């Protein structure tokens, strides 16, 4: 059993996971990432406000029993969930080919 | 119809999305994020190697027809997929409460 990732704590754009519980859901327990700071944590450990922590969104397939309280075989649905956070700036940067492909 | 996020291009840990296609999959077209650089792009637009771009992993529910080539009603499965990348360092940083809750 491998140790669950600590990226949420070591990221320059750290996040906390919030539990979402509903009986009309599969999985019933869903973990949503909420960015810790508006800014990003620089190399020195300080918050820089010329950078922003933004949540990465993903469309997840969840099972919904129609009519309610009837689990067997039906049709599922899609829901947007925040998986983690990334650090952005207002600039689209361009960097050489030798730094690429990793 | 809202413009799909450009975080993959403005992130300090940028990524590219690779298409995964299989007839025994729902959704059949899956987008996997692959980190562009080993390092992270600093504020100046340069690659810093005392930081690392790491992919954020998420467990997605995918439909698998058993026996193959029979779509109607059966039992689905879980698969780990890379959604995007984040910037990490070897240090777990600690920052004051007024910079928190955002």
């Amino acid at each position: 059993p491998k140790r669950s990732s600590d990226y949420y704590n070591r990221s320059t754009s750290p996040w906390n996971l919030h539990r979402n519980e509903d009986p009309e859901r599969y999985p019933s327990v869903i973990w949503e990432a909420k960015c810790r700071h508006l800014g990003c944590i620089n190399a020195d450990g300080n918050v820089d406000y010329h950078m922003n922590s933004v949540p990465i969104q993903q469309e997840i397939l969840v099972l919904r029993r129609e009519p309610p309280h009837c689990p067997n075989s039906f049709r599922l649905e899609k829901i947007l969930v925040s998986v983690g956070c990334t650090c952005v700036t207002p600039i689209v940067h361009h960097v050489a080919h030798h730094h690429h492909h990793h | 119809p809202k413009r799909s996020s450009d975080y993959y291009n403005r992130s300090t840990s940028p990524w590219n999305l690779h298409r995964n296609e299989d007839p025994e999959r729902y959704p059949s077209v899956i987008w996997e994020a692959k980190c562009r650089h080993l390092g992270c792009i600093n504020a100046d637009g340069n690659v810093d190697y005392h930081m690392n771009s790491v992919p954020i992993q998420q467990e997605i529910l995918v439909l698998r027809r058993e026996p193959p080539h029979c779509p109607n009603s059966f039992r689905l499965e879980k698969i780990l997929v890379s959604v995007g990348c984040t910037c990490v360092t070897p240090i777990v940083h600690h920052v004051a409460h007024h910079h928190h809750h955002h």
Epitope: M51, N52, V54, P90, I91, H94 | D44, G45
Partner: antibody
């Protein structure tokens, strides 16, 4: 025909608050990132704060951390700067500015430079 | 933070003369993302150049820019009375965006 008009400036004592407004006209306001740029009397230009199209991202200069808040109302074509705990060194003319952007294929590319400026509003912080 | 140093502080030339304005960055500016602004007294700045060498809309041919990395230049091939103002360079290749302290271009008589 395109214009940015700032208002809200005036005299305020140190430790005081002031809200600046910028009215945008002649263009699709929601298509652009906007910034506040200031200039102390007889001095140079200085970046204050940036905001993206839908206000999901807000950026600030080091000196205004926790004191200033940038916001926008796309339906009212307005930009705002809430200035709290004002300091004497905040005394300046504040400019509302529009950022240049490009659309390559179906991708929006923001560039952090200003193709349109307002006339500015004088903010005096003094006792 | 990239620090932009402009030279000279004041430039005294007559209409008809060529003007050379310098902007030196403390560190290399990504993708030559350097802009120039003209500001006349009591007025807001006005964009002249972007991307080190490209003219903004409505800017006449006498204005030209060049340079890369850390060294950039603004040239006015033949000065007209209307060109006497303060000029600021601004970089947008590094976050945060920063400006030079300006060069004032005054009429030599």
């Amino acid at each position: 025909e395109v214009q940015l008009v700032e208002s809200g400036g005036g005299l305020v004592q140190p430790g005081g608050s002031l809200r600046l407004s910028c009215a945008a006209s002649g263009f699709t306001f929601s298509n652009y990132w906007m910034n506040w740029v200031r200039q102390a009397p007889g001095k140079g230009l200085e970046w204050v704060a940036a905001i993206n199209q839908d206000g999901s991202e807000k950026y600030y200069v080091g000196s205004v951390k926790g004191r200033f808040t940038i916001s926008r109302d796309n339906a009212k074509n307005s930009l705002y700067l809430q200035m709290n705990s004002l300091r004497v060194e905040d005394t300046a003319v504040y400019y509302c500015v529009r950022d240049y952007y490009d659309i390559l294929t179906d991708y929006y590319i923001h560039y952090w430079y200003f193709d349109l400026w307002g006339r500015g509003t004088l903010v005096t912080v003094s006792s | 933070e990239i620090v932009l140093t402009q030279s000279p502080g004041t430039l005294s030339l007559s209409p008809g003369e060529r003007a050379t304005l310098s902007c030196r960055a403390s560190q290399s500016v990504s993708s030559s993302y350097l802009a120039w602004y003209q500001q006349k007294p009591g007025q807001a700045p006005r964009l002249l150049i972007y991307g080190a060498s490209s003219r903004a809309t409505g800017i006449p041919d006498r204005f030209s820019g060049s340079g890369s990395g850390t060294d950039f230049t603004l040239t006015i091939s033949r000065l007209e009375p209307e060109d006497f103002a303060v000029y600021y360079c601004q970089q947008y290749g590094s976050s945060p965006c920063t400006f030079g302290q300006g060069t004032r271009l005054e009429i030599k008589r």
